[PDB]
Design a protein around this ligand. Sequence first.
Ligand SMILES: CC(C)(C)OC(=O)NCCCCOc1ccc(S(N)(=O)=O)cc1
Ligand SMILES: [Zn+2]
Length: 257
Amino acid sequence: HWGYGKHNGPEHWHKDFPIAKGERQSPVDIDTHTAKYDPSLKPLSVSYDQATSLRILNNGHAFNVEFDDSQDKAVLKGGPLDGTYRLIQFHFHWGSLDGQGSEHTVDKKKYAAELHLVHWNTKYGDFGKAVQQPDGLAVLGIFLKVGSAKPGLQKVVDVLDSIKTKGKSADFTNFDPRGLLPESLDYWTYPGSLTTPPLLECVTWIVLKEPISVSSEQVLKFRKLNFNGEGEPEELMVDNWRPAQPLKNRQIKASFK
Ligand SMILES: CC(C)(C)OC(=O)NCCCCOc1ccc(S(N)(=O)=O)cc1
Ligand SMILES: [Zn+2]
């Protein structure tokens, strides 16, 4: 099955998921000089004060922190979005080295990791329905660079030892995702896709301009996770990112001058 290795990685995904060569695939390179300021954009509304985290899971491709999305508890609105998008999970992509790891790039620069907060459009009832719609998801993307530690990330880092291998999960309640946000909500936005199979073209991407900084110790603990299940040969979970895809007939819009 699909992965990030030499024999099942991004270059192979099109064989099972032909949409991999589609017209609105993600991630992309964000060329800052060609992104256009769009005064018609509204401010982002991030309302996470009643977020209810449930669990953290190693799914063999990344680790997901899952939320109760059966009510409007943590929602994204405004910006390019019409309607209300509910937070369902967040996860990261990261590298084996500090100079790679992000999926989006900025003027071809790669960051050490990238955070994806995944939301679905409540007009579609559930996540499974939403991924089948062109405007079904909104993913908030946040770059990570290595520098000072991110205090709000440490509770995630501390539990990773309990979910080392594929299939392992742990209780993870009362986590506040607001502690993962940068100061500024300035963003770029464009229409795209899931960056993993099934690569569905259902995502409005909102990528924040300002990265958060994490410590080398924090990202080193990401790199100790395993792709494999317990009792299988150990393969470190690193470089779980898809490279930039052709922009084709798309324009990136910026919320800022
Ligand atoms: C039957 C099946 C599984 C083919 O249909 C599904 O319902 N697809 C479910 C979608 C699961 C993928 O979840 C994500 C993958 C990647 C991202 S990312 N890296 O773009 O933010 C988000 C969700
Ligand atoms: Zn992702």
